[PDB]
Amino acid sequence: HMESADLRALAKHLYDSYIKSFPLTKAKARAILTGKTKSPFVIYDMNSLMMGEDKIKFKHITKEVAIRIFQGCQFRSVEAVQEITEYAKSIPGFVNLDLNDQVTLLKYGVHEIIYTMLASLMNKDGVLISEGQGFMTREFLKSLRKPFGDFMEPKFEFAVKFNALELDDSDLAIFIAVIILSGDRPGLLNVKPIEDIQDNLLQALELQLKLNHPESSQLFAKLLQKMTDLRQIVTEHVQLLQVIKKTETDMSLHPLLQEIYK
Amino acid sequence: HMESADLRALAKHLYDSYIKSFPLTKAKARAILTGKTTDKSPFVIYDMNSLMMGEDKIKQSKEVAIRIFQGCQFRSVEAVQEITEYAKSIPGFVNLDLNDQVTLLKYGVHEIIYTMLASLMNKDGVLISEGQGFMTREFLKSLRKPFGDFMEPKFEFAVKFNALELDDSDLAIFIAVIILSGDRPGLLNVKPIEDIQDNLLQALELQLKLNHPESSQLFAKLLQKMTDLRQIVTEHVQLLQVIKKTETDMSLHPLLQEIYKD
Numbered sequence: 001h002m003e004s005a006d007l008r009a010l011a012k013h014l015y016d017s018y019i020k021s022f023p024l025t026k027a028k029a030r031a032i033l034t035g036k037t038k039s040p041f042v043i044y045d046m047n048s049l050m051m052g053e054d055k056i057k058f059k060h061i062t063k064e065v066a067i068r069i070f071q072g073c074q075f076r077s078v079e080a081v082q083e084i085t086e087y088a089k090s091i092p093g094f095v096n097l098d099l100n101d102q103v104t105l106l107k108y109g110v111h112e113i114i115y116t117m118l119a120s121l122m123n124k125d126g127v128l129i130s131e132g133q134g135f136m137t138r139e140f141l142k143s144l145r146k147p148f149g150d151f152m153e154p155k156f157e158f159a160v161k162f163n164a165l166e167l168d169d170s171d172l173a174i175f176i177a178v179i180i181l182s183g184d185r186p187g188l189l190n191v192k193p194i195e196d197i198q199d200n201l202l203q204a205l206e207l208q209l210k211l212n213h214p215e216s217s218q219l220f221a222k223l224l225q226k227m228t229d230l231r232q233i234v235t236e237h238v239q240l241l242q243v244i245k246k247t248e249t250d251m252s253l254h255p256l257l258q259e260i261y262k
Numbered sequence: 263h264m265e266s267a268d269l270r271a272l273a274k275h276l277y278d279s280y281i282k283s284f285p286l287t288k289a290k291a292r293a294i295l296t297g298k299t300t301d302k303s304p305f306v307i308y309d310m311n312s313l314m315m316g317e318d319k320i321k322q323s324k325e326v327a328i329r330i331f332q333g334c335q336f337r338s339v340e341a342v343q344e345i346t347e348y349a350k351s352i353p354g355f356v357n358l359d360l361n362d363q364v365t366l367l368k369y370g371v372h373e374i375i376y377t378m379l380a381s382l383m384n385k386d387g388v389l390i391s392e393g394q395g396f397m398t399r400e401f402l403k404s405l406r407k408p409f410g411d412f413m414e415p416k417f418e419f420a421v422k423f424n425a426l427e428l429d430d431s432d433l434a435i436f437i438a439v440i441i442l443s444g445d446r447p448g449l450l451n452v453k454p455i456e457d458i459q460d461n462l463l464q465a466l467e468l469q470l471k472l473n474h475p476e477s478s479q480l481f482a483k484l485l486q487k488m489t490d491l492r493q494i495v496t497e498h499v500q501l502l503q504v505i506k507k508t509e510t511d512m513s514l515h516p517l518l519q520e521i522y523k524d
């Protein structure tokens with residue numbers, strides 16, 4: 001199918017583009033979370049939230065507290081969609097696909113990639129925000145009232161499990177490419193070139209994981225099994241939104257904002 | 263890690279046990295479905311009267327949709343028994359903590375039933391009663407109330423899964439990999455399960471490479487199918503819950519009830 005030297009070139013191409021498209025890499029996030037430092041501002045309760053938006057002026061959390069935080073997560077997710085969209089254009093073959101197929105792959109893939117990349121910003125105690133300048137504790141997020149408290153905790157539970165695989169940025173760049181090129185998205189017009197690119201990406205990922213994690217047996221297989229966890233959590237997430245949308249009335253934004261966050 | 267000769271021994275062990283445990287193999291099912299044989303032709307059920315004739319040829323005071331649905335429960339209980347018997351042959355399974363053995367079976371039997379049901383399916387229907395009968399997809403879809411849509415997601419999965427062109431020797435290892443899943447909820451000792459799955463995954467990877475050398479990345483594509491299995495299981499549980507809250511004429515088998523609790 002492909003020669004070993006071309007797989008390394010494909011892997012290197014993707015790593016370089018992943019560094020340019022995403023501002024906060026996993027490598028940089030890990031330096032912040034471990035204490036291998038400029039200490040980030042910590043949000044662990046209501047009062048520290050107030051000071052953080054005064055001193056750092058977080059653009060997501062600029063109503064009621066639980067709602068503002070929820071809406072802030074939505075604001076950042078929309079920013080991330082544009083970053084993933086730009087990275088997708090760098091995947092060899094992607095821009096040559098039918099234009100409707102490109103849109104379909106991005107529409108159905110962004111939720112899985114956001115959760116994946118969110119794990120890079122998380123440990124068991126909290127999550128980095130605003131390109132790593134702030135840190136919101138898991139306990140503060142989990143203690144939000146009514147449905148918002150239980151909306152936040154599944155992300156951590158997944159992230160803790162995913163991070164135990166100890167992937168680095170060069171591994172993640174290929175993994176994310178593999179997610180985008182999923183030939184089973186509904187409504188695809190020409191599945192064949194999509195699965196051909198994914199076959200290339202899978203070959204590159206398998207060789208990457210063997211060279212970069214030679215002691216970690218069947219890591220390739222284990223990473224692929226996590227695509228089940230992602231799909232399952234994305235479906236749960238959708239059901240959580242519907243329940244919020246059908247119950248919370250204090251959630252109306254400016255109609256232009258509602259449109260941006262469709 | 264394992265030596266290549268030990269992986270072939272494990273594949274042969276597993277295929278041998280699969281033949282002993284499951285009386286209706288994919289090889290036998292395909293010979294019946296393909297035809298060109300006068301001694302293995304099934305009786306075809308496509309409407310009420312042919313169902314009437316079927317109980318005379320194949321082999322009561324109830325409704326048809328119920329009768330058929332109850333038939334699927336009875337065969338499901340038999341399948342759980344066959345799958346339980348196969349699992350005991352998987353090296354290391356019976357040595358696990360007793361509660362984990364129960365847990366792996368509780369969550370694994372459905373994913374395996376849907377996998378193996380695909381062997382009995384084509385795009386037009388499914389073999390029944392040890393291959394003596396064949397019930398058309400259209401007839402199943404036309405059953406009333408909630409029962410009409412009970413089978414159709416299974417057909418949808420089978421058409422895609424069957425396009426992988428697996429044979430029984432491949433399926434034997436794949437089924438073993440499903441059972442030894444270390445991410446089942448409530449497992450007590452995840453590590454000894456994952457060590458066994460690591461071995462089974464290595465055996466599956468080498469099996470697929472030798473038996474389908476031209477089918478690039480079949481290993482990865484097959485692992486991506488565990489995502490489709492998980493989702494069909496979830497839909498099915500929700501169909502039963504709706505059935506249980508309306509149909510009282512239906513008792514489930516205690517073995518089935520226990521698997522679905524939680």
Ligand SMILES: O=C(O)c1ccc(-c2nn(C(=O)c3c(Cl)cccc3C(F)(F)F)c3cc(C(F)(F)F)ccc23)c(OCc2ccccc2)c1
Nearest residue numbers: 060072073074076077080111114115118129141151152155
């Ligand atoms: O920088 C980034 O790459 C980034 C990426 C994502 C997110 C993020 N998305 N998100 C979702 O719920 C989600 C997902 Cl997981 C997927 C799709 C849609 C949404 C939704 F619904 F938001 F639209 C979160 C939930 C939590 C938690 F559950 F732990 F609290 C934490 C973070 C996220 C992100 O958070 C930045 C942020 C967090 C809190 C306040 C202000 C900003 C950064």
